[PDB]
Amino acid sequence: RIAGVNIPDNKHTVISLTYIYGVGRTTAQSICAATGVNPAAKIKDLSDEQIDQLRNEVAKITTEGDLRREINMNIKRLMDLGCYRGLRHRRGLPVRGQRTKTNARTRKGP
RNA sequence: CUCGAAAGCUAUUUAGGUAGCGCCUCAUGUAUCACUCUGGGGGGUAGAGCACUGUUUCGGCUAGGGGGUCAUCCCGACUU
Numbered sequence: 349r350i351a352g353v354n355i356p357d358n359k360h361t362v363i364s365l366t367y368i369y370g371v372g373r374t375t376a377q378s379i380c381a382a383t384g385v386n387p388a389a390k391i392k393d394l395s396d397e398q399i400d401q402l403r404n405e406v407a408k409i410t411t412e413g414d415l416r417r418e419i420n421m422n423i424k425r426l427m428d429l430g431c432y433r434g435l436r437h438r439r440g441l442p443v444r445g446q447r448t449k450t451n452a453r454t455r456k457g458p
Numbered sequence: 459c460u461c462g463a464a465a466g467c468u469a470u471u472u473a474g475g476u477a478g479c480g481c482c483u484c485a486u487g488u489a490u491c492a493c494u495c496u497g498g499g500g501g502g503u504a505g506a507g508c509a510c511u512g513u514u515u516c517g518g519c520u521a522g523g524g525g526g527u528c529a530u531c532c533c534g535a536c537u538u
């Protein structure tokens with residue numbers, strides 16, 4: 349609603365744009381370069397004018413409310429085909445080819 | 459010589475005792491009473507019924523738990 353989500357205050361611009369969930373850190377360094385907003389000032393000190401140009405960039409990359417939708421179909425395409433990358437992805441095993449006998453605990457919990 | 463019962467009720471340290479009412483008798487009064495016919499009158503019993511509360515048999519049409527279950531990593535449902 350503010351830029352797609354709420355944006356914190358009393359912070360620099362590149363840090364503030366990070367919470368938009370679809371722009372990391374290197375991408376938000378291009379947006380202040382392409383628009384011209386100084387990151388060295390806070391978001392409080394800005395004008396209420398050029399935020400549309402920041403909002404123009406949000407309408408060109410992705411939005412987290414639909415980013416998580418479309419990335420699920422990338423998962424969902426892998427599951428319903430029954431390919432090996434979606435075979436373990438149904439179950440909960442690691443995917444990229446890690447070791448399974450021990451230590452793969454961030455995909456199985458405590 | 460004339461008339462003629464009861465073994466009921468309530469209470470009881472009561473139950474085989476006793477006391478009030480019900481039933482007999484003799485007096486005094488006073489006027490109602492039985493039987494039957496024609497009336498008016500409420501009722502919930504025998505019977506009967508399944509509208510309620512329950513209980514019972516068969517049949518259909520089914521909701522379902524799904525019983526099978528094509529069975530789908532895990533999801534459709536195949537089938538009945």
Ligand SMILES: [Mg+2]
Pocket residue numbers: none
């Ligand atoms: Mg006699």
Ligand SMILES: [Mg+2]
Pocket residue numbers: 474475
């Ligand atoms: Mg005695």
Ligand SMILES: [Mg+2]
Pocket residue numbers: none
């Ligand atoms: Mg009867």
